[PDB]
Design a protein around this ligand. Structure first.
Ligand SMILES: C[C@@H]1COC[C@@H](C)N1c1cc(=O)n2c(n1)N(Cc1ccc(Cl)s1)[C@H](C(F)(F)F)CC2
Length: 544
């Protein structure tokens, strides 16, 4: 039991980011008052970071306390599923606490949970079963407290929830198709195939509904396979954009050949809650871009049109991670009652070579300026209001201020590079948002880029630096920033699980990736120092 002075020193340690490396001096203090810290749920993660698991007595002593401790939070168990831990009892404990989460929260961490399998017992996975095997053909070729591992648990929940089933499927499918993994880590590629085999197996074993989930996934797999075959053809067609589009619509029209315009209701892999009847052949076109991506309009169950960007010949995993993080950041912000009107549009890689994107009706800021002159002109044209600020609907102005603040902070934390008016989009409802996340975590095609993604034209849109709207922008920025800092351990743990994913800007320096995010939070500052720090970044970016 420690004195009043020691307790403060322990508290400094317990409050540390999950990433920060514990000094020997710190390691010994935690090791000493380990029976004291038992009632501190947040200290358990700092305790298991002291232990040298290579030492049986130290490992054994550590596990006794793990049973005695105040049960860990769901957000903190993600720490135990990283590469830092190899102890089966620890990894089993993470899963045991992770089971406390509901499916909504699980989906939030699913991309990372799939990556965490890379640190699981590959043999234990293989035992669960009852180049040679093609992963894409597993589901399409059906054959006539601390007990569960990560693999068992995910599969278990995936069989009860169709939304999880879908993302579990496509996440694991993309891991299986990873060439770098096949080449450099064959035993990992072999694990993912076995995860996919265990999944197909568990679904086949299920009730009427679970057996249909498997056919649905096969239908989805088959549909994607045909859309790829159509894409390869369109990308190959000799001619101009008009020639390739006519080929695109011709093949989409040919339902007997291609089977893409009229299909039995199947969930959209991108967003499974949306079921689709097929693709409208006549509204399909390629974007001007040299990668030849297509704009395809899906026919939904209840009469809607769901536009997608389907890319073939590009890896969508970086963009996929960023949009799932923006979606998480938006969810925590909303949780803290701060809806900043963000566009966390869906992105799903259906392979390392292709994937889907949720298309949002929007206009690039560049176009807005080159057609209407200003953001305020655009807004007066589509949302005029006499009583409103600068002749614009207050709702639209409120949406504009909120989304600008939200994206300023989010793109600041994620170190989003290559920012230009062509990859900043506006909606007639006042929604501002970012697209194309090719450069993140401090990368940029140009050297020494600004830490904040602001400009003259963005502020002009609010009514300039002297407006009431400009004050509210600053207020929203530093409010959003304080909130996101409150979930720094959750964000940092999720990024901790992304180090061994083949995401270009993470692959570049895995060992230094999480510190890049950690440093943006400026956890060294108090919330008041943080609020002033955020104002300095905003002011400097605007004045420059
Ligand atoms: C899916 C999202 C959200 O909804 C709107 C849309 C902008 N979007 C994105 C995201 C994204 O990464 N890109 C694109 N559109 N277009 C860029 C543009 C497409 C349409 C424009 Cl207008 S500007 C091209 C691509 F063709 F290669 F994909 C370059 C990359």
């Amino acid at each position: 039991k420690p004195n009043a002075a020691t307790r403060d020193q322990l508290n400094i340690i317990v409050s540390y980011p999950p990433t920060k490396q514990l000094t020997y001096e710190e390691q010994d203090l935690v090791w000493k008052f380990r029976y004291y810290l038992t009632n501190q749920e947040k200290a358990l993660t700092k305790f298991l970071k002291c232990v040298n698991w290579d030492l049986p007595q130290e490992a054994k002593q550590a596990l006794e306390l793990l049973g005695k401790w105040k049960p860990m939070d769901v957000e903190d168990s993600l720490e135990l599923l990283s590469s830092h831990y190899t102890n089966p009892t620890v990894r089993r404990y993470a899963v045991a606490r992770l089971r406390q989460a509901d499916d909504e929260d699980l989906l939030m961490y699913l991309l990372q949970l799939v990556q965490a399998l890379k640190y699981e017992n590959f043999d234990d996975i293989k035992n669960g079963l009852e180049a040679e095997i093609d992963s894409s053909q597993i589901i399409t070729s059906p054959l006539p407290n601390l007990e569960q591992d990560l693999c068992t648990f995910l599969i278990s929940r995936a069989c009860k929830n169709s939304t999880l089933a879908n993302y579990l499927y496509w996440y694991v499918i993309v891991e299986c198709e990873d060439q770098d993994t096949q080449q450099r880590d064959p035993k990992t590629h072999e694990m993912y195939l076995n995860v996919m085999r265990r999944f197909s197996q568990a679904l086949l074993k299920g009730d009427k509904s679970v057996r249909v989930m498997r056919s649905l996934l096969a239908a989805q797999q088959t549909f994607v396979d045909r859309l790829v075959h159509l894409m390869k053809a369109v990308q190959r067609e000799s001619g101009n954009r008009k020639k390739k589009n006519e080929r695109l619509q011709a093949l989409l029209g040919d339902n007997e050949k291609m089977n893409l315009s009229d299909v039995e209701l199947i969930p959209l892999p991108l967003e499974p809650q949306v079921k689709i009847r097929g693709i409208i052949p006549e509204t399909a076109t390629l974007f001007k871009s040299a990668l030849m991506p297509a704009q395809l309009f899906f026919k939904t169950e209840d009469g809607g049109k769901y536009p997608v960007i389907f890319k073939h010949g590009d890896d969508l995993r970086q963009d996929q991670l960023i949009l799932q993080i923006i979606s998480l950041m938006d969810k925590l912000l909303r949780k803290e009652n701060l809806d900043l009107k963000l566009t966390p549009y869906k992105v799903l890689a259906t392979s390392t070579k292709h994937g889907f994107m949720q298309f949002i009706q929007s206009v690039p800021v560049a176009e807005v300026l080159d057609t209407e002159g200003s953001i305020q002109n655009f807004f007066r044209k589509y949302a005029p209001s006499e009583n409103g600020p600068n002749g614009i609907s207050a709702e639209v102005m409120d949406t504009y201020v909120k989304s600008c603040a939200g994206y300023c902070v989010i793109t600041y934390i994620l170190g989003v590079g290559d920012r230009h008016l062509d990859n900043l989009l506006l909606t007639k409802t006042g929604k501002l948002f970012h697209i194309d996340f090719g450069y993140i975590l401090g990368r940029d095609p140009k050297p020494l880029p600004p830490p904040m993604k602001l400009n003259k034209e963005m502020v002009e849109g609010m009514g300039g630096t002297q407006s009431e709207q400009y004050q509210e922008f600053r207020k929203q920025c530093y409010t959003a920033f304080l909130h996101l800092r409150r979930y720094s351990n959750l964000i940092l743990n999720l990024f901790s699980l992304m180090v061994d994913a083949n995401i270009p800007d993470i692959a570049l320096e895995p060992d230094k990736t999480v510190k890049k995010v950690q440093d943006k939070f400026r956890l060294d500052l108090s919330d008041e120092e943080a609020v002033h720090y955020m104002q300095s970044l905003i002011d400097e970016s605007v004045h420059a």
